[PDB]
Design a binder for this molecule. Sequence first.
Ligand SMILES: Cc1ncc(COP(=O)(O)O)c(/C=C/C(=O)C(=O)O)c1O
Ligand SMILES: Cc1ncc(COP(=O)(O)O)c(/C=C/C(=O)C(=O)O)c1O
Ligand code: NA
Ligand code: NA
Ligand code: NA
Ligand code: NA
Ligand code: NA
Ligand code: NA
Ligand code: NA
Ligand code: NA
Ligand code: NA
Ligand code: NA
Ligand code: NA
Ligand code: NA
Ligand code: NA
Ligand code: NA
Ligand code: NA
Ligand code: NA
Ligand code: NA
Ligand code: NA
Ligand code: NA
Ligand code: NA
Ligand code: NA
Ligand code: NA
Ligand code: NA
Ligand code: NA
Ligand code: NA
Ligand code: NA
Ligand code: NA
Ligand code: NA
Ligand code: NA
Ligand code: NA
Ligand code: NA
Ligand code: NA
Ligand code: NA
Ligand code: NA
Ligand code: NA
Ligand code: NA
Ligand code: NA
Ligand code: NA
Ligand code: NA
Lengths: 455, 455
Amino acid sequence: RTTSQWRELDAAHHLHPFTDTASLNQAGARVMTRGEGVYLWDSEGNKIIDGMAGLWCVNVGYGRKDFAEAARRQMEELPFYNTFFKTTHPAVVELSSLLAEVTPAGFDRVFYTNSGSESVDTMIRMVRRYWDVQGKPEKKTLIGRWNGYHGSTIGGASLGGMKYMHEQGDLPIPGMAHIEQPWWYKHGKDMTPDEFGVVAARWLEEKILEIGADKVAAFVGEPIQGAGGVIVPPATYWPEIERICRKYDVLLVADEVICGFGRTGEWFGHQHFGFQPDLFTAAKGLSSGYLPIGAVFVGKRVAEGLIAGGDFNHGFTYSGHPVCAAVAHANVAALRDEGIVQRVKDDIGPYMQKRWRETFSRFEHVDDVRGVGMVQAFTLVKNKAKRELFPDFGEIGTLCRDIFFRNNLIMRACGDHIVSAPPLVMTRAEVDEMLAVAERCLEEFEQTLKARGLA
Amino acid sequence: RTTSQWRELDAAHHLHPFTDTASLNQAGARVMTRGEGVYLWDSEGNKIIDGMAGLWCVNVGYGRKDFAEAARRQMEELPFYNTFFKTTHPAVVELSSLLAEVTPAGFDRVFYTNSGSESVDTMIRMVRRYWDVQGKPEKKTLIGRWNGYHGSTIGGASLGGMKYMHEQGDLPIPGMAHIEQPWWYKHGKDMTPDEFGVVAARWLEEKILEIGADKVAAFVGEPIQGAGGVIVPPATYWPEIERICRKYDVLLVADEVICGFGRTGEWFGHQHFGFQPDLFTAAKGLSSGYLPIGAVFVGKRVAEGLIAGGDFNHGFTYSGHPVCAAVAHANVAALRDEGIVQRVKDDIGPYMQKRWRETFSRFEHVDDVRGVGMVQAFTLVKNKAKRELFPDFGEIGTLCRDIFFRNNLIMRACGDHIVSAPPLVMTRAEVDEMLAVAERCLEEFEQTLKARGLA
Ligand SMILES: Cc1ncc(COP(=O)(O)O)c(/C=C/C(=O)C(=O)O)c1O
Ligand SMILES: Cc1ncc(COP(=O)(O)O)c(/C=C/C(=O)C(=O)O)c1O
Ligand code: NA
Ligand code: NA
Ligand code: NA
Ligand code: NA
Ligand code: NA
Ligand code: NA
Ligand code: NA
Ligand code: NA
Ligand code: NA
Ligand code: NA
Ligand code: NA
Ligand code: NA
Ligand code: NA
Ligand code: NA
Ligand code: NA
Ligand code: NA
Ligand code: NA
Ligand code: NA
Ligand code: NA
Ligand code: NA
Ligand code: NA
Ligand code: NA
Ligand code: NA
Ligand code: NA
Ligand code: NA
Ligand code: NA
Ligand code: NA
Ligand code: NA
Ligand code: NA
Ligand code: NA
Ligand code: NA
Ligand code: NA
Ligand code: NA
Ligand code: NA
Ligand code: NA
Ligand code: NA
Ligand code: NA
Ligand code: NA
Ligand code: NA
C-alpha cells in the first residue's frame, strides 16, 4: 500500500484519540510503519527520533524479538482464559509473583486491567469500597488537581483536571474535587520553589477543610504531571501532601502510569519524591507498550480492607490476559536483569539531565528547563525576566512541535510546554543526536518568532 | 510448578475480577494451562469442555497458530505506535478497512479501545458530545435496564443495572436511568411473550416522559442480555424500543460486546432482532479474546456530529494497538473467509438450538429453555406450573454451576439462569458431547436439590 492509499483508508474508517478528525482527514495522517531502538520509520522512508517512546511507554525501546517470542509461545499454548470463574493461569500468577519482587515493600497484591484509564477507575471503586468496609460510607470524595491527567474513562477524566475533557461528557462525576497544580513558573509569585511547594501542598489541607475530612476518601496525583507538561513539583511538595493526607485520615494515591517502571531512575516516581502511597496505578512501561496491560498495586492497608469486604464486583474480560501478562513479565525481568532502571538512575539519567540543561538554558524564549531521570521539559515563554507566557497558551507550542515533526524528531507540546520521554535504553550518543536536532529546531523557532514580530 | 505452588502464589499476589478473594484464597484457584479447539486442560490434567468460550469471546476456538504468527510478525515490525499525534500505522488502517466490509451499512468509522468497558465509556462521552454539538446540552441522560450489563468502568457499571455493582463506588453517576428488563418468565403475568414485549418496550416511553424527552440522550441495550442470564426479549420488543427512541429524538445504542462477531448467527445481535442503532459497542469476539481490543462502531449521523465538533478529547494510549489490530484483522477475516458466521446461521446454530431444547425441556426444575445461534440458556425453577423461582436467586444456580465444573464442563450461572456460549466453530459431535455432560449434571443437580430439602 502507498502513503496516499493508507491515508485515504485512515480518513474514511478511523476515529483517532484526542484528534480534530475533520482537520486530520484533510491534512493526512503520518503513517508509522517500523520501529527499532529509539527510531521509527514512516511510509515515506523518513527515519524519526522518537523522543516520546511511543506515548511515554516504550521504555526498553522498539525491536525486542524476545518479547514477540514470549507472545507467540503464550498465544499458542493458551491465548486467553478468564480470572472470573475461581480460575487463574500460569502467565498471570508468574507476573503477579515477579511484580511483588520489583515493587516497594508492602505491595504484595495486584489487580489487572487493560489500560491506565481502567486502573484509575479500578482505584476509584477500590478507594470507595475500602471506606464502605470501614463503616464510613460518607468518605467518598477523591481530590485531584487542575492540569492533572488520570486517563480518559469517565472516572479518570473526572479525577483528571483537564477542562477541555470535563466539557465533553458533563464531568466531573460526583465525589470529585480539584486543587491548583504546583506550577511554580505561573503561581510562584515572589516565593522560592521550596516556599511555593509548602503553599501548593497546603491547598490540599484548605480543600479538605472546605469539604470536611469525614467526606474525603483520597488525594490522587502523578508524582510528575505528564500530559499537563512535565510539571515537576518542588522538593517540599510531596512530603507536605503526605503529612496532610495522614493528618486527615485520607488515602494517598500515586498515579505511576508514566513515572512507573523506571522513568525517574527509581522504579516508581513516589520513591524519587519520597512518599509512601496506599495504592498506585500503572500501565505504559509495565509492558513497554508491547501489549495492553495495566494494574493497581494495592498496599497492605487497602488490600486487607478489600479482602475483609467479600465480593469486589469489578473487573474486565481481559484482566490478567495470558499473552499480555507473558510480555509484561519479559519486560519487567528485562528492566531488572539487564540493569535498565539502574542505568537511568546512575548513568543515562544524569547525562540526559546535564545535557538537557546545557542545550536549552541559553534560549531567549525558553525557561523552566527541568527534568528527572529520563523525563524532561521546558516552557516556551514571551519574556523570561517577567515570567510572561505567550497568549493563547498552546498556539506557540504547536508551532514548535510542527518544526520538530518536520525535522523527524518527536517531542510533544503540552500547551507551550515542550516535553520528552524517550526509551530508557537511549545511549549517550542518541541523547546528543536528539538534542542536536532539537537545538537546530529551537534556533529556527526563534528566527520565525522574530520574523513574525511575536518575539 | 505444581498445582499447590501456583495456588500459593495466586493467593499471595493476585486480586481477581468479580471474586470473593478471602474465599478463593482458602478454596484454591483452578489453574487453566492449555487450550485447543473447544477444550481446556487444567494443572491436574483434566480435559474441560469450554461451553463459555473463555468469557463469551473465543469465537474461533483455541489453538489458532496463524493468530500467534500475525502477533509475532507485527510485534517485531512495530509493537506500538500511538494514534494521537496526527499519526496512524498499517495494522489499524487495515483493520478499520476490513471492519467496514463486515459491519452493517452506514458503519464506516470506528473508534478503538482495549475493552468492552472502555467502548461503553467512549459511547457515553460520544452520545453526550453529539447532543452538545446539536445545541442540546440538556440531552445527556442515557437509559439502560435493571440486570443489563455494560462493563465495569464507573460509566459502564452506572449504565449497567447490577445493584451489586452500583453499591460499590456510589453508582450510578448522574444522567443515568433504568427501566425493568423484558424478562417474561418473572414479569409476563398472563400476557403472551409478544404482548409482554410491547409492554416491556413501553416502559422506555414511560421513563422518557417521566424524565422529559429534552433530557434523554440515548437508550442502550444488549440485543440479548448476557451476564444477566441470556434474557432473550420477545420479537415485538426491539421494533417498539426503536419506534419509541425515534419518536422522542433519542439515540439508540446496541451493546454488541457479547452478541457481536457472529454469536446469534448474524454478524451483530441488532441484525437478528431487526433494529438500526446509531452506535454499537464491541470487544470479545472482535479478536476472539486472543488480544485485548474493543471498538465503538459509529453510524453516519453521530460520526458527522462528532466530526462537526472539532477535537474529541477522548482515547487510550493503546487505542488501535498494532499487535491487537493485526490479531483482530486475522480473526475477522477468518470469521468471514472460513464461513464461521454463515455456519452459525445456516448449520451449527439450528442444530445447537434444536438439541438444546431436546435435552433440557424434560427436567422438572428447568424452564424457559431458550437461545439463538450459539448463545443458549435455561432457568432452574422451584415449580414450572407456577413459574415459581427458588428463593435467594443465585444460590441454586451456584449449586448447579459447581456440579458442571466438577464434571469438567464450563457453563455459567447468572443468578439461577444457566448459560452457554461455546466457540462458534464447535462441531455437531462437540455439541452432543457437551449436552451429554450437562444432562448427567442436571440429573445429579435435581437429586442434590431434594437431598438438601430445597426442592
Ligand atoms: C498519569 C496517567 N494516568 C492514566 C493514563 C491513562 O492511561 P491509558 O488509559 O492507558 O491511556 C495516562 C495516559 C495518558 C495518555 O494517554 C497520554 O500519554 O496522553 C497517564 O499519563
Ligand atoms: C454486553 C457487555 N458490554 C460490556 C462489557 C464489558 O467488556 P470488558 O470491559 O471487555 O469486560 C461486557 C463484558 C462482560 C463480562 O465481563 C462478563 O462476561 O462477565 C458485556 O458483556
Ligand atoms: Na536499525
Ligand atoms: Na522500598
Ligand atoms: Na515500602
Ligand atoms: Na451536568
Ligand atoms: Na516566584
Ligand atoms: Na492525553
Ligand atoms: Na530517591
Ligand atoms: Na532521588
Ligand atoms: Na538491555
Ligand atoms: Na545508585
Ligand atoms: Na547541546
Ligand atoms: Na489565555
Ligand atoms: Na485439586
Ligand atoms: Na521485523
Ligand atoms: Na467497505
Ligand atoms: Na454486517
Ligand atoms: Na451489510
Ligand atoms: Na448510519
Ligand atoms: Na440488579
Ligand atoms: Na445532572
Ligand atoms: Na453531573
Ligand atoms: Na428480579
Ligand atoms: Na395459570
Ligand atoms: Na416512569
Ligand atoms: Na460480569
Ligand atoms: Na403506538
Ligand atoms: Na425533532
Ligand atoms: Na493479511
Ligand atoms: Na480476507
Ligand atoms: Na483464513
Ligand atoms: Na471472503
Ligand atoms: Na475454520
Ligand atoms: Na437459518
Ligand atoms: Na401462574
Ligand atoms: Na459454592
Ligand atoms: Na456446591
Ligand atoms: Na473438533
Ligand atoms: Na465427556
Ligand atoms: Na415434585
